[PDB]
Amino acid sequence: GLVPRGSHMPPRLQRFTASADEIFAAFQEDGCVVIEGFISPEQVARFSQEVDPAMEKIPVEVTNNGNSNDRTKRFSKCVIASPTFRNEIIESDLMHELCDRVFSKPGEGMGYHFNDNMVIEVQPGAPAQRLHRDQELYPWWNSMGPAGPECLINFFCAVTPFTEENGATRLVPGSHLWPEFTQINERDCPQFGKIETVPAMQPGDCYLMSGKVIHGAGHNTTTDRRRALALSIIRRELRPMQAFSLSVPMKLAREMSERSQTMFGFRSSHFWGNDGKDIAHHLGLI
Amino acid sequence: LVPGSHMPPRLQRFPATASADEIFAAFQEDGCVVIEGFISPEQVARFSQEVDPAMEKIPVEVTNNGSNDRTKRFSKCVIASPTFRNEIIESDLMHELCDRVFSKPGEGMGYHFNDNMVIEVQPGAPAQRLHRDQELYPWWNSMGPAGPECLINFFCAVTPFTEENGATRLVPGSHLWPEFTQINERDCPQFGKIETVPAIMQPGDCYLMSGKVIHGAGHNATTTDRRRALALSIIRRELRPMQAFSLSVPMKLAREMSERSQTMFGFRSSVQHCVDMVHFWGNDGKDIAHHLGLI
Numbered sequence A: 001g002l003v004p005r006g007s008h009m010p011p012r013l014q015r016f017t018a019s020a021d022e023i024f025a026a027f028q029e030d031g032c033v034v035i036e037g038f039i040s041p042e043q044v045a046r047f048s049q050e051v052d053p054a055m056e057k058i059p060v061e062v063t064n065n066g067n068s069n070d071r072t073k074r075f076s077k078c079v080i081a082s083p084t085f086r087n088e089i090i091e092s093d094l095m096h097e098l099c100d101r102v103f104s105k106p107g108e109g110m111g112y113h114f115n116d117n118m119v120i121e122v123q124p125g126a127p128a129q130r131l132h133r134d135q136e137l138y139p140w141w142n143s144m145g146p147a148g149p150e151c152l153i154n155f156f157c158a159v160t161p162f163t164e165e166n167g168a169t170r171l172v173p174g175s176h177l178w179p180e181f182t183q184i185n186e187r188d189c190p191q192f193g194k195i196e197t198v199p200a201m202q203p204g205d206c207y208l209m210s211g212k213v214i215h216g217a218g219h220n221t222t223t224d225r226r227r228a229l230a231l232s233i234i235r236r237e238l239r240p241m242q243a244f245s246l247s248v249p250m251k252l253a254r255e256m257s258e259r260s261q262t263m264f265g266f267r268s269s270h271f272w273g274n275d276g277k278d279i280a281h282h283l284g285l286i
Numbered sequence B: 001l002v003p004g005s006h007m008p009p010r011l012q013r014f015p016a017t018a019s020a021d022e023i024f025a026a027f028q029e030d031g032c033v034v035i036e037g038f039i040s041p042e043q044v045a046r047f048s049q050e051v052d053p054a055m056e057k058i059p060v061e062v063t064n065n066g067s068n069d070r071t072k073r074f075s076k077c078v079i080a081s082p083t084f085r086n087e088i089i090e091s092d093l094m095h096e097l098c099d100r101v102f103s104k105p106g107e108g109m110g111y112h113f114n115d116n117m118v119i120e121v122q123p124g125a126p127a128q129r130l131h132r133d134q135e136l137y138p139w140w141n142s143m144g145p146a147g148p149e150c151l152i153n154f155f156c157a158v159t160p161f162t163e164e165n166g167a168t169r170l171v172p173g174s175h176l177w178p179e180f181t182q183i184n185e186r187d188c189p190q191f192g193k194i195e196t197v198p199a200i201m202q203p204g205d206c207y208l209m210s211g212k213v214i215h216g217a218g219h220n221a222t223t224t225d226r227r228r229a230l231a232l233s234i235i236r237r238e239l240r241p242m243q244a245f246s247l248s249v250p251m252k253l254a255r256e257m258s259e260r261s262q263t264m265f266g267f268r269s270s271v272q273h274c275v276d277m278v279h280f281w282g283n284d285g286k287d288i289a290h291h292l293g294l295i
């Protein structure tokens, strides 16, 4: 009794803070999954307050250009600006145990690190964002199709509420299993215009989406800044969009755990080394 | 010429004053090509001299496993060698060829440094397993020869490369086989049947090789010869380097670099286009070179 008997049933999008082997199976089966309450209530709140001054000084472009910057604010310096982010959120033992199932291989330590820490605020009346796979960031990955390894996953977390009206993210569950991975336009995608989305949540819930999954922010209302926190995580062989080890000051890196140092590139795992030695030695982190 | 003798595979040779289109054509055909005088004999001799203290402090590891042992590997070339940072990495032919491999229209430099490794193969050192350098990026073989390029190496003779002292063994045209497997008995059907050719070179010569080319260091069967190489390993901007150069190379040395050299070492970003434009290795919407103060 999930849809009225006889109706078309829409692509499946499971919801779940229980077993990691559990959430991981929903990820594998569908390409994405929701984690209701991924960051605590006040945590999501103290976080949003802490980055709000930074958001306040980001001007809004009104361009009708088609870009992803048309009335959408984006801001990446979350570690610099938010103590609760760098002290609490990125230390979710849930994140890591999930990242460990997507990415790490046995006896090789952490096969993952951060790509980005982005706060995305869809301004009211913002055109719906182009449909895309995140792994289009790494242009050849689509050419490996659904059988290729995972390159990227997003812990996409709501900051203000996510509604059909304010432009929450439209997901396409199961698009990680399509036979050919393509750009999503009328020229390159045959299914263009027939692609059945599902809008994605309340402040603190996150959805865990594969980089193979087609998606996009929808159209935005008259006075609702729809604000989100994207934890982009990639495998250790890939380069981050943000140069976090050169902008996050050494002070904050000294306060991080070994594993979070590895996420921001203040520590190696043999990639990102220093002539046969961990880069951590040279940085005065023993 | 040899005498109905079997003629082994051809490794094409060009002087460093040839058309970058002529050299790249060879690279595209065979997957590897020798560039003679890539570095001048005076430049390489100063380089060898400037890194030689660091090389002598490096213990030769001998092991009871015949392991990629008895090979010295040193990567702090920028810190240790003015010739390297002031002249060698400013090779225009090197950047001409990288652009033809990596750089898309309208996205600036599509490449950067993976590594800068002095590789000195010691007397008696055993040969290296046959491998492709793109095995570093483990999904890459699965795209086969149609896959884009992830990596190229400018592998320079610092001291002479001879068949006896362990000059690299290469397989021209292995970037074109229909299936890219690891080269072992389990997965490779040609295992044991693969014909290689050595990179015979004088100091300052180099070969340029695709990550798709099967190759391995040869056995050093001499008693005197420490066979010294300089490997300039260059990858796509989207891939992680093996060296964290921006974190170990001093900022004092960063400020002295040309802007394309800063990009190579991650002191400066490059802009990638997907409708959307994105700084790769950037700082919250701006080139990382602002926060660092490099203009």
Ligand SMILES: C=C1[C@@]2(C)C[C@H]3[C@]4(C)CC[C@@H](O)C(C)(C)[C@H]4CC[C@]3(C)[C@]1(C(=O)OC)C(=O)[C@@](C)(O)C2=O
Residues within 6 Å of the ligand: A067, A068, A069, A074, A116, A118, A132, A134, A136, A137, A153, A154, A230, A231, A232, A241, B274, B276, B277, B278
């Ligand atoms: C240029 C962009 C790129 C190429 C990559 C992404 C990307 C790093 C992709 C992976 C994600 O986990 C996440 C949320 C961290 C985004 C953040 C925004 C940008 C940087 C981007 C953007 O800001 O557009 C002006 C885009 O929105 C987009 C969709 O179009 C892109 O595909």
Ligand SMILES: O=C(O)CCC(=O)C(=O)O
Residues within 6 Å of the ligand: A068, A120, A122, A167, A168, A169, A215, A216, A217, A218, A228
């Ligand atoms: O803002 C959103 O809801 C989607 C974010 C996204 O997909 C992107 O910017 O790449």
Ligand SMILES: O=C(O)CCC(=O)C(=O)O
Residues within 6 Å of the ligand: B119, B121, B128, B133, B166, B167, B168, B169, B215, B216, B217, B218, B229
């Ligand atoms: O030293 C050589 O000639 C081969 C080096 C090589 O192929 C490698 O280290 O990947």
Ligand SMILES: [Fe+3]
Residues within 6 Å of the ligand: A132, A133, A134, A215, A216
């Ligand atoms: Fe996206």
Ligand SMILES: [Fe+3]
Residues within 6 Å of the ligand: B131, B132, B133, B215, B216
């Ligand atoms: Fe190699």
